[PDB]
């Protein structure tokens, strides 16, 4: 049935957005602990820029969820139902036991429109999104810049490493390569002056 097809697509999206908020807030929790344990003026300014990015991932993902759930609920059951945790209804709809479907399909197409502007689904994934943002790069370079000589490259290494040990405590080959990739994309700006 066409409703059982869209119900499966709606539930897959709802489960994916729920995991987005879980990953992002888990990053925020380790960052706020990492910010409180250490007393440095510099690295704390990085956590400020990073926290502002991670919290806004959560606000965006919850905004998409609360908009999609009533939309999915109306389609699955045409009879008036606009409540949260519709997970049970579409799940059983997806298995067993048109206007609103059109309404739903568009919102799913609308949702993916913002698929590019979506932080990770895991803690490693959100971390990668954090370092890719200009806001974090702009904050990081301002801290390492010196008025006279060239910006300090060794400090930029140390600050990014401390941030990466705030979010992902256990280092991996991927975390190391991710740290190197982000620092490399900044090489043009750490040679100015």
């Amino acid at each position: 049935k066409n409703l059982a097809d869209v119900a499966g697509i709606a539930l897959a999206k709802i489960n994916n957005l729920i995991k987005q908020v879980s990953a992002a807030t888990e990053a925020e929790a380790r960052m706020t602990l990492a910010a409180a344990s250490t007393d440095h003026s510099n690295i704390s300014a990085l956590y400020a820029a990073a926290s502002n990015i991670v919290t806004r991932c959560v606000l965006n993902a919850v905004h998409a969820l609360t908009s999609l759930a009533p939309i999915a609920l109306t389609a699955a059951t045409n009879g008036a139902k606009t409540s949260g945790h519709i997970s049970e209804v579409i799940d059983i709809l997806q298995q067993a036991s048109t206007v609103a479907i059109r309404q739903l399909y568009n919102k799913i197409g609308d949702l993916e429109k913002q698929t590019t502007n979506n932080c990770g689904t895991s803690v490693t994934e959100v971390l990668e999104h954090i370092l890719k943002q200009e806001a974090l790069k702009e904050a990081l370079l301002s801290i390492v810049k010196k008025p006279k000589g060239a910006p300090d490259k060794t400090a930029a290494d140390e600050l990014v490493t401390a941030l990466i040990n705030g979010v992902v405590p256990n280092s991996t080959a991927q975390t190391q390569k991710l740290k190197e990739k982000i620092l490399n994309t900044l090489v043009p700006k750490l040679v100015e002056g």
Partner: antibody
Amino acid sequence: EVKLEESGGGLVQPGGSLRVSCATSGFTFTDYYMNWVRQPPGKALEWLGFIRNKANGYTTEYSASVKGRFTISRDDSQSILYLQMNTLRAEDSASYYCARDKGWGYAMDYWGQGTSVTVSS
Amino acid sequence: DIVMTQTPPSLAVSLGQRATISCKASQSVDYDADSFMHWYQQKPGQPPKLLIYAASNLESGIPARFSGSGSGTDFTLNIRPVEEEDAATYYCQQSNEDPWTFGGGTKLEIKR
């Protein structure tokens, strides 16, 4: 200013081993990633690998043509870079260049003159 | 496992004119808008010299006659105006995915 020289090249028998070295001066060796690159006579440049600095764990990356046979190491006390070659084959004959990395496994901004290795019986 | 294809393999340009060398990647060597493509010059018997890093950044000490552009899979190196000292082979290199790879090289001949 920045100076890297290569040394240790020579004639090697097939299957034999050879260690080439790179003495550097004019910059803080410890702060930089270092690469090895080779060029067979009349052929294109070929990246062999790099070694990370002290801050990033002294670990290495290698191309597959050389993985398992060659080992890159460094001596931060003397600001010298090494490449240890084992189980050499005839097509490993090339000029071997030591090159300083501009970033963290990025582009190579300073190169040595190179040292020549010939593998032949 | 990124393959680098340079075109043309050989190029002859008159003094004062423009030389354009192109590198085509088998897959993207970019990371969002940031490029991991670099250009080197090698005169015969000499070590390579880095000209351009990250597609378009001119390395310090290199004259403004060199410039680079491109994104994703297609990049070009530009020499304007060409001089006698430009007689050399030029290589692209990508550091986007391990292992780093080089192009096959382009030999530039200066007409006289």
